Amino acid sequence: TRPTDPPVYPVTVPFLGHIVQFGKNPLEFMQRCKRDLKSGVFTISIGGQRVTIVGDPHEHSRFFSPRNEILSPREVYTIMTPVFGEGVAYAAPYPRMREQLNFLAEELTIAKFQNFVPAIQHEVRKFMAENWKEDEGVINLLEDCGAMIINTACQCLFGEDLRKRLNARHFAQLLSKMESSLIPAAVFMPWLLRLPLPQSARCREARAELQKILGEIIVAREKENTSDLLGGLLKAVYRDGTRMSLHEVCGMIVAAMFAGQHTSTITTSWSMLHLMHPKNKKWLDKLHKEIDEFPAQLNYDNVMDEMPFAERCVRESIRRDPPLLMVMRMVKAEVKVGSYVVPKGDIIACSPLLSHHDEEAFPNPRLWDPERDEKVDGAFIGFGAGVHKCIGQKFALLQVKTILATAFREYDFQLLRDEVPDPDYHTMVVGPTLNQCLVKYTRK
Amino acid sequence: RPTDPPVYPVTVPFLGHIVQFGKNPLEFMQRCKRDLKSGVFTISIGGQRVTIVGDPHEHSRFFSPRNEILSPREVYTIMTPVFGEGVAYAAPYPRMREQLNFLAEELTIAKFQNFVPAIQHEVRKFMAENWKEDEGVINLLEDCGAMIINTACQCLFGEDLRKRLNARHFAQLLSKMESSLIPAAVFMPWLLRLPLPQSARCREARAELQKILGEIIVAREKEDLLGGLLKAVYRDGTRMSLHEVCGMIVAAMFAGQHTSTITTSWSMLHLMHPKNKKWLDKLHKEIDEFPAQLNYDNVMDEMPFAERCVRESIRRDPPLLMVMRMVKAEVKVGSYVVPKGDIIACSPLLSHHDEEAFPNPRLWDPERDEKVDGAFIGFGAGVHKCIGQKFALLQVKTILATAFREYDFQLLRDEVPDPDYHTMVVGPTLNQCLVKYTRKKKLP
Ligand code: HEM
Ligand code: HEM
Ligand SMILES: OC(Cn1cncn1)(Cn1cncn1)c1ccc(F)cc1F
Ligand SMILES: OC(Cn1cncn1)(Cn1cncn1)c1ccc(F)cc1F
């Protein structure tokens, strides 16, 4: 304790200290901390590592503004090394990391988008046509949104040859094996990673199978690409004279697909679940009124400039239940957050989960109300902000919006459950409880 | 202190020797046996003393003592989310025994009568559907996996359970439970008090199975393994709960799935390697005696050579590396006494490589025999000896008889695969298992 420290939540069980409670309900646990300590800015213990939460939305900037030398991502992203590739992205020196991210940025922006809406529509219609064939049936909506999200992304981002060698299902399995390997505990207790774990070898094996497949597509392709993701990075030349290695190319592909697969899936699922719930009739009607204006074949302009209501729907689903609960950095140099200074060596967090539930910024936050707006500027941080803000944001909104436009024009849905699913907090990227996602479709 | 196995010296207290042991348990335990000039020694895994009874003349003093002296419960804690909380090792010891015995009395032995032809059918159906070409490239470890689930399901389940729970779906649930486990935790039990998404994947998989099994039982109550345990009445008046029935089904299939798969794969890999021509000929000479339809007697009393082949595969590379107990009361092992609170281990991997018991142990030689009585402990011994042993050998022998009568195989690699030690249950490195099949016959 220095006298310029956020209040600390009292710890019992030193070795843990709060990992079980936080682990069990992050929302409920961080709101008890904010309330009992009368402070938005506080410090918990996770396995003995101090974690300072910047849970006051008026203070959001002081987390998202500072450069890499003050608030550092590398150390928190160490867990992802076996996914992105060993010296890749956050694990490269910071200027090279930025080029790598920017090369990905410039493949989702924005002459590239031109063929995206119709490629998303085609995959959605093919999926509904093959899986929702009956007049009426029961589906698990989280599993099917998953299938659609991989199918649509693949079709937007890959040539037919890569898709003929790596089908969407096969891809989802590889991505899924990588994700289910990770142990979020270790972000806070990095010694856990010096332990032999079969999980990390499952995750390297998965990554290595992808690079192998990708390498075969590249040799094949170099015997007589244009718009597609792979062919872009193939042609990326760094500041210096040099080109990307296979390992890095695989890196940025993994990173883009890994990023969007679970988060957009969850978001599409949440959005539909709200929309189909009886109380939410008012909003389902508003959506049909936006979307029934449009033709069978949609375009860039339809989805982008002319669906502000669908967007509000997607944006509020992520507001109520952000899939990424916590944004984190390692405090390399002490920092003023409000009053208080966060000491060197702390993990500093800014939590979309917690900030999207501040009663000042989001009055009555458990209410899903798509016509609402943040009452504190910057409060919404679902896709981050500052130097690390999400670069799939635009792709993600357009994909989810396009699916909603296509699914609801064609089907009605009934939630088979009285209430909207609980969020299930046992997993790294957080979604609605899988158990509770049975829905009944009626073909219109 | 004076009556303690020599301790391998520890640097890095926190880990002990988890990394070395983690990376190559054979080489690491043989360096310990050689430099300390003692079969019986004590290593450190994350700070827990582990005493290895690595002298085969001393095997009995590990396997003989009853549950009050050498206790399994504490080492089986990791499997709680698989078998079911409170189930098997987690029940009091007498009830544990009834539960195991009920499982035992479902693989012994009027039950076996229909097993050989059900294994053959599934094997021929699999080859017919997957090895259809004149010749092709398969991954042998994956396909032995598919055969092992298909054959066991067809031996153990009624049509109705197989209709509702297909073999592939079963394999996924099993595989999801198994890839959750963190063997480190057997030695550092505090790791389990950590919220991990791994355990929740494992519980969810378990709970999907019970739910399906519960639907089969209600369906079935409106006029094989499942129906046995349904019929089981304990010593007292009472019957098994759904939770325990699920437990014993999960335990028997979890048990056989990865170990038999690994054994079938090893067996074939050796037999197909050019240097093992001598043995591949002997096998053909045993099996070419028999008709197209085999029976119990064919596989059981009349294939001593195939068995030697299976047994030597497990001898060179046992899938379960370490048999373990918690020392509740101090025990004499050779000279030395193993203190209360030590984990006492007996390692098939290490004892199957003692020069005395198994001269030149990295040689696969199916005609060899242990030169130290009891040395082979691939299926354990004493009160906890494997109860799928008989079923395992019959399954593998029946597959080998069926595969090799119909196909030849070429290892696509100069040498037999390395064992891959990154995984809980150990097999041949998946990478190195590409094999080329040549079909010897036609129809379908
Ligand atoms: C609703 C879906 C998504 C959500 C909620 C989301 C959320 C976020 C958040 C909160 C961050 C900040 C990470 C940090 O500050 O450490 C982020 C970063 C990132 N996202 Fe997403 N994201 C989504 C979709 C996508 C998609 C589809 C892509 C595919 C390109 C993507 C690629 C990335 C990348 C590369 C970063 C790091 C970029 C950088 O470090 O500058 N995301 N995302
Ligand atoms: C090649 C295949 C197999 C190998 C190498 C193997 C190995 C072993 C070993 C070493 C043990 C000793 C456990 C201990 O002392 O902790 C064991 C126990 C056991 N096995 Fe297997 N096993 C195999 C196949 C199977 C199969 C197919 C089943 C299916 C029912 C099965 C069911 C069991 C059960 C229930 C136990 C515990 C019984 C008790 O504690 O009394 N095993 N096995
Ligand atoms: O944030 C992730 C990594 N992550 C955090 N929790 C679990 N995985 C996911 N993500 C970000 N946007 C969408 N998904 C990510 C994946 C890729 C990446 F380049 C950065 C990055 F933070
Ligand atoms: O030993 C297993 C479970 N296990 C041990 N290490 C990793 N998983 C495997 N096993 C035993 N025979 C075949 N496989 C087991 C599974 C079921 C069981 F009842 C006991 C038991 F030890």
Author numbering:
A (entry chain A): 27 to 250, 257 to 476
B (entry chain B): 28 to 250, 260 to 480
What does the article say, verbatim?
Although largely a backbone trace at 3.2 Å resolution, this structure served as a search model for molecular replacement in determining the CYP51Tc–fluconazole structure at 2.35 Å, which was used as a search model against the 2.27 Å CYP51Tc–fluconazole data to reveal an alternative conformation of fluconazole bound in the active site. The two CYP51Tc–fluconazole structures reported here superimpose with r.m.s.d of 0.68 Å, revealing some conformational differences in the F-helix and the BC-loop, which may account for the distinct fluconazole binding modes and result in re-packing of protein molecules in the crystal lattice. The 2,4-difluorophenyl moiety is enclosed in the pocket formed by the heme macrocycle, the aromatic side chains of Y103, F110, Y116 (BC-loop) and F290 (I-helix), and aliphatic side chains M106, A287 and A291. Although fluconazole occupies the same pocket in both CYP51Tc structures, it adopts two conformations that differ by the 180° flipping of the 2,4-difluorophenyl moiety. A 2.6 Å H-bonding contact between the 2-fluoro substituent and the hydroxyl group of Y103 may help to stabilize orientation 2, which appears to be less sterically favorable than orientation. In orientation 1, the H-bond between the 2-fluoro substituent and Y103 is broken due to the 3.5 Å reorientation of Y103 toward M360 resulting in the 2.7 Å H-bond to its amide nitrogen and in the flipping of the 2,4-difluorophenyl ring into a sterically more favorable orientation with the fluorinated edge facing away from the heme macrocycle. Perhaps both ring conformations co-exist in the CYP51Tc-fluconazole complex, possibly correlated with the conformation of the BC-loop which affects H-bonding pattern of Y103.
Trypansoma cruzi, the protozoan agent of Chagas Disease, is closely related to two other major global pathogens, Leishmania spp., responsible for leishmaniasis, and Trypansoma brucei, the causative agent of African Sleeping Sickness. Here we report the crystal structures for the CYP51 target in T. cruzi (CYP51Tc) (resolutions 2.35 Å and 2.27 Å) and that of the closely related CYP51 ortholog from Trypanosoma brucei (CYP51Tb) (resolutions 2.7 Å and 2.6 Å), each bound to an anti-fungal triazole drug, either fluconazole or posaconazole. Nevertheless, CYP51Tc and CYP51Tb do share 83% sequence identity, a fact which has been crucial for successfully determining their crystal structures and makes it possible to extrapolate structural features learned from one enzyme toward the other.
